[PDB]
């Protein structure tokens, strides 16, 4: 299992981005009933290549299983249209829409997607 930090609300996501400033971020939107989320856990997030590729990224997760009012406000704020969705933010906190993942990807494809992100190493 990756080590995700859970957020619930828009305000919590924004505070997590403040704290992560200087490092890239991945936000996974999760629900227990979404089969592709469980397939990410089984086939992709479980693969050592992906786990090592993400070691220097801050990992956030929003569990929207209940579809409660905070969940829905968060999804709306992010203009998320369904699950699965994974968002990527750079070291300045800027989301890059082209990097959104909106269907299952296996480990090789997800790793290649990670590699394609905006450069995020300091010097
Ligand atoms: Na804040
Ligand atoms: Na990017």
């Amino acid at each position: 299992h990756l080590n995700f930090t859970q957020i619930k609300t828009v305000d919590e996501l924004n505070q997590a981005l403040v704290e992560a400033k200087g490092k890239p971020v991945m936000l996974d939107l999760y629900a227990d009933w979404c089969v592709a989320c469980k397939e990410f856990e089984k086939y992709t997030f479980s693969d050592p290549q992906v786990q090592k590729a993400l070691a220097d990224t801050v990992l956030l997760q929003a569990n929207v299983t209940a579809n409660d009012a905070q969940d829905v406000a968060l999804l709306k704020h992010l203009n998320v249209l369904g699950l699965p969705t994974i968002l990527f933010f750079d070291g300045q906190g800027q989301e890059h829409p082209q990097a959104r993942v909106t269907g299952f990807m296996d480990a090789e494809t997800f790793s290649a997607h990670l590699r394609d992100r905006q450069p995020h190493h300091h010097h």
Side-chain angles (χ1 to χ4, degrees), residues 88-90 94-99 113 116-119:
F88 293 90
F89 305 78
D90 65 20
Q94 307 304 303
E95 195 231 327
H96 295 278
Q98 51 267 41
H113 188 82
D116 245 279
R117 286 185 289 175
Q118 164 176 299

Side-chain angles (χ1 to χ4, degrees), residues 88 98-101 105 109-117:
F88 293 90
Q98 51 267 41
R100 288 186 185 203
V101 174
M105 284 185 175
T109 306
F110 192 65
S111 294
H113 188 82
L114 295 177
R115 170 165 56 244
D116 245 279
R117 286 185 289 175

Side-chain angles (χ1 to χ4, degrees), residues 5 9 14 16-17 26 32 34 37-38 42 52 54 66 78 80 86-87 90 96 107 109 116-117:
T5 291
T9 63
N14 285 142
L17 294 176
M26 179 178 96
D32 287 333
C34 177
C37 292
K38 304 321 238 126
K42 183 171 163 74
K52 289 184 183 108
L54 286 173
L78 296 176
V80 168
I86 309 172
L87 270 58
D90 65 20
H96 295 278
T109 306
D116 245 279
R117 286 185 289 175

